[PDB]
Amino acid sequence: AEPEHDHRKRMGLKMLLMMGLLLPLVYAMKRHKWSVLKSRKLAYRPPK
Amino acid sequence: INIRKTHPLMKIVNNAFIDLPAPSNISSWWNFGSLLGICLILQILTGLFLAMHYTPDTTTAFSSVTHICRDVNYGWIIRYMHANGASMFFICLFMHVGRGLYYGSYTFLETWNIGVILLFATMATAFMGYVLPWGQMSFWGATVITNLLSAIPYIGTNLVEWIWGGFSVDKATLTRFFAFHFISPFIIAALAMVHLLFLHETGSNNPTGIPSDTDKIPFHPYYTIKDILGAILLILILMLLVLFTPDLLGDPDNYTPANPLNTPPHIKPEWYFLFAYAILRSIPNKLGGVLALILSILVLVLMPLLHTSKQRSMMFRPISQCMFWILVADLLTLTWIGGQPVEHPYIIIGQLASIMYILLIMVMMPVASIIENNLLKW
Amino acid sequence: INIRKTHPLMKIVNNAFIDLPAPSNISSWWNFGSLLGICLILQILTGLFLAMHYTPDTTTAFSSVTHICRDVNYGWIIRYMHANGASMFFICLFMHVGRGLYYGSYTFLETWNIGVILLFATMATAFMGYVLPWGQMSFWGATVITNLLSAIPYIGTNLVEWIWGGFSVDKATLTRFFAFHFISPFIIAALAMVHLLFLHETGSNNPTGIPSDTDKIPFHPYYTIKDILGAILLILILMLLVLFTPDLLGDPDNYTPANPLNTPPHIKPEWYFLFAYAILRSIPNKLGGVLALILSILVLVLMPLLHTSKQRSMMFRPISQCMFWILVADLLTLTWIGGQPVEHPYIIIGQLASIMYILLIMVMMPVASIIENNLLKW
Amino acid sequence: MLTRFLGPRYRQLARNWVPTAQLWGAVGAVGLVWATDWRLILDWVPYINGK
Amino acid sequence: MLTRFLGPRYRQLARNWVPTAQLWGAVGAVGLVWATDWRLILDWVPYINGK
Amino acid sequence: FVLQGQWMRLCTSATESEVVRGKNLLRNALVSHLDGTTPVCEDIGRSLLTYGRRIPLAEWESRIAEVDARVVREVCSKYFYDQCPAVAGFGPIEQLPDYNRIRSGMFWLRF
Amino acid sequence: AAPTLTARLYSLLFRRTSTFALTIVVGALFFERAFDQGADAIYEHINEGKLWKHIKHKYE
Amino acid sequence: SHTDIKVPDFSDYRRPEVLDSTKSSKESSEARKGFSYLITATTTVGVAY
Amino acid sequence: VSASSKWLEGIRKWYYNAAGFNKLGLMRDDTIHENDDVKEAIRRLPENLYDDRVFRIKRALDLSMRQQILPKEQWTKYEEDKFYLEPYLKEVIRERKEREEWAKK
Amino acid sequence: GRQFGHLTRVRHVITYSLSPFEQRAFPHYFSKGIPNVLRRTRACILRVAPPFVVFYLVYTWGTQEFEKSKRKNPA
């Protein structure tokens, strides 16, 4: 059934890293995008 | 000019994903959707590749299964895996239902009924599709839903024949459902683009609940990248449960070869199919059971018809929320209820759970709605 | 207002069939199109119902075939029948190609290349789909196209493995193609709605060849009812050859069970697949043969690129028409050419037929175009 | 909110549609008949008796 | 009709795109490499030597 | 898409023709500042104010004369490329995309 | 430096879109074989339960 | 009558490099977009694998 | 938004401190789920009002994304809230009651 | 429908923008996460819990109910 219980096990290891790498890198990128929108200043200054 | 603007197929495209203006306030409620399709795609994808090897032949059942499993390298992985992934699709499915619910998104009918088609569709489309393994669980259980084919007055006998192909479930079925699976996914797909365009029409709601025209951006970058994220989250999910403990969710009765004489003790549905079979065995009558079944989602249709409050977001409606997570309590409640075989306490237990479903939705949730209204005073 | 105007899905609909303004001058060139889709639908329809019983299993091949034939009442009819109907689809297919040709409709690119996708797509989509019967003809012939999988430098060995699944055609293939069929039809479908919307965009041409805005009506009643007619014409066609002499078009080698050791004398393609295999065996080199093959339709793409004349309708271009029906002569010519097994006269015969294909289209047809232009003097 | 269509007005509307309503209803019913030829009703059918 | 884009103008256009053209070309090629890792090229790869 | 793209077009597309054209532009115009009494006047004023010098007719016509379209491609890239300069409409700006779009447009996927 | 990493490796690397890509795959090699290797090391220190067996299998 | 507006302070959100009115991002930018670009390419090159 | 209505409209005051609306400083009227009646109702809205509800709405979106809320001080003044539409709205309630009325007629 | 420019009516308002590379990805990251985080969560908790309470009470409870109900007695 799971001889790759060895082999597949191996892959899982890299997975642990990929996310830990990407997941941050991903999240970053997301923030990297959204950041400006975060801080926006839009003014309600109705005339008079 | 800008081909992005210009190209007609693109003209759809930009209009679809790209140029798409969308509520800026948008909330994580999203992700699941693309997931599902990704899921769906992968679903097909894998199934396809799966199909590529797998045979669905009577003698081949466990046989090819071994060839598709014991032989099949990563047929291990792809097989058992994306098999689990199905269940994941169910996960975001029920989830997503929640999404609309606490959303209260029920405002958009054709969408709602659409995903209702998606609902029962997903249900059996699985079930048949699911059963394809023809495993001892799915086998005596095949005698089960096979015995579901007989319900009607004057018909089922002839029906569960026609359904069943004849005097019982058979290789007849094997082909029958086997195909039925082969077809239905496509149905899901076109259904999808359908409900999709339906969406793009109205646009759609917002977790805020206010008219969105105030604030919109395209999915790119925002909802786009966000989506990419949630995808990675998925591969975490799927590629996790898969990657680590594939069998964790299983029921050993599957790996049990179908043994026509067997009929063992258990007879349960999938964590996907779970909450039903409890609901099924709950009542002591045929169409009670069924009409209940279709009356759960159908019930949800009524819920859109039952929509009451002068405000969309239950966010502002706390007592409502009590009914919300409470209703959920009734739900996974119904799970663990099914989580027992027929038992003395359980009898009463689920027996009341139904009332809840009828109350906690049809009464207590609507009654709740009226109440909150009364309180509203504005 | 008018829901016909109003309803969004309908808004497509009316925009699609119903409200659709269309050239009044419109000509019978039409019919085939809906036919094909009807065909296609029926195709699916039958295949589906066919699928419903049929099993595509290795031991089951002729076996289930009997169960799907010798057992199967109207599996007789539906089977052999709509099997023929496939060929009919090919009939209107090549026809339809003609439609554009004497039409010269090549004006609309994305349509043309679209139906090119439709072209090779239809071709193999059949072939794999076709071969599914796994019959002695399709069997040793399976060794044939199976031997087509090997063409490339450095690859085919490994390729016709990967294609073939391995050391030969196998049950490996059986699943493989079997699915491949299951998939591709859908592909055809979405492709269809694609090319369709593409059409609705430009609108499209007219047998007259003049700008159509002068005259238009909706398909209803006109093109509508007309379509209904041509449909009845179809059921005449299909329901005829079917209804009367089902086996008429067959090659007995089919009913011959696959006999792995057999390899009998014939090895031909379908009246559908016909004109190819001649073209194939014509040349003495691998990629000559293939590049020719894809270069027939691809050639047709070039023909749109090769479009020359200052006037659309060959109707006004008689010498052109000579090249037209003449080219056809080269075509069914190529058929009867394939209509012989490898033979002394034939060798030269087809050997020239190719030149024609290269001349009668690529040269003599274009050369013709230039000529007619010269004559035009206007 | 039946009061919306409940009024001697829409009442009269119904009074209009009624006979037609009978008509289309019959359409459906007979359709079930010939379509089905369901034995249950099929029995009473004389000379439409098939045996 | 190459004369359409044949002129010292569009000629100059090419003169511009050329180095870039090299660049994207390289992109494709190397892609074939890493993607494939085709033995034919793979051999020459030192320390990318996998055995 | 025009502007930045034109800029993109610019940043890439140089053909000496226009270079010579706007050369003649700056020539005619070149008069039109030099030409005119007050324009020449204030021209002196900021001329030393900033400069302290006056680009002579053949000095300004020198660096001018020196004009180089290589520096068009390059120097263009030097100042221009991959930046966030000013854009201001007035009124209902919805066609203003985001900095994440409009200024994503500040970047070129044309390459 | 790191300013020419961020910058020159924008400029002389990440600037040109292609160059950014060619850089990307250029890594795809090194990363690929490397992580392959060190990964193998992880599994290696994990067990020594087989395929080290040959010497124990007396590796005929 | 129309000109009186003003704008807010980015500091709380501001990354360090921009802190000063003193200096030109003429240096900074390439470094900033550099870091980000780096991260991005990390996501491209890794994802490629 | 005061104690009876800080319990009850303190689902909108104390319990929209919990359910958010007024502690989010929302506009009571603004909470009505958009409907047709609501729609043209707003179409008839007063102008200076329209601006007001606008800034309110947008801001709401703003902190919403920010997933923050204004100072609890800045959290809206209880009671002390004009019913903005309710004269206008309720007027329309009579309207659609009127179209609805002669409609009934 | 939407897209833009037929969109909607906005009079007498104003904006301010900033280029992305300007900011820092995580100002007060841990800091700001905060009983800010507990502000959302903790804010919701009371609203959330009771049903789940009943749950653990249940699967626990009935778990005992039937579980014990599986025990055999004398006579």
Ligand code: HEM
């Ligand atoms: C059209 C694309 C699909 C194809 C070609 C496909 C084909 C298959 C085949 C051949 C099997 C049996 C082999 C095996 O169990 O590993 C299977 C199992 C299954 N797939 Fe699909 N299916 C497709 C789409 C779906 C969809 C949409 C779902 C619903 C999420 C789904 C959920 C399942 C389930 C529940 C099973 C059985 C459980 C198991 O994996 O053991 N698949 N499918």
Ligand code: HEM
């Ligand atoms: C085949 C599974 C489904 C797919 C692929 C699908 C796809 C999507 C997508 C892509 C969105 C975009 C916005 C978002 O996610 O919030 C969406 C929103 C929505 N879906 Fe589904 N959906 C599916 C099942 C359902 C179900 C089961 C329902 C409820 C019966 C449903 C009703 C809605 C509604 C009402 C929205 C609007 C959400 C909002 O704006 O708040 N769909 N769906």
Ligand code: HEM
């Ligand atoms: C999957 C098979 C095909 C289907 C279902 C299909 C469907 C249709 C339909 C419904 C029309 C409507 C008008 C008419 O029939 O004249 C049409 C017209 C057309 N089709 Fe196809 N078609 C198919 C294959 C082709 C092929 C093989 C070509 C040529 C390579 C082609 C090129 C055209 C063109 C150019 C027209 C415009 C006809 C005119 O207005 O005169 N299509 N097709």
Ligand code: HEM
């Ligand atoms: C997706 C819908 C389709 C399905 C499910 C389907 C499935 C099948 C199956 C299972 C067979 C073997 C059984 C038999 O030969 O009777 C078959 C035969 C065939 N069908 Fe299809 N097919 C479909 C669409 C098509 C299409 C689009 C064509 C092209 C017109 C096509 C033409 C053929 C041909 C040539 C054969 C073999 C000849 C024969 O009938 O003996 N079918 N198909």
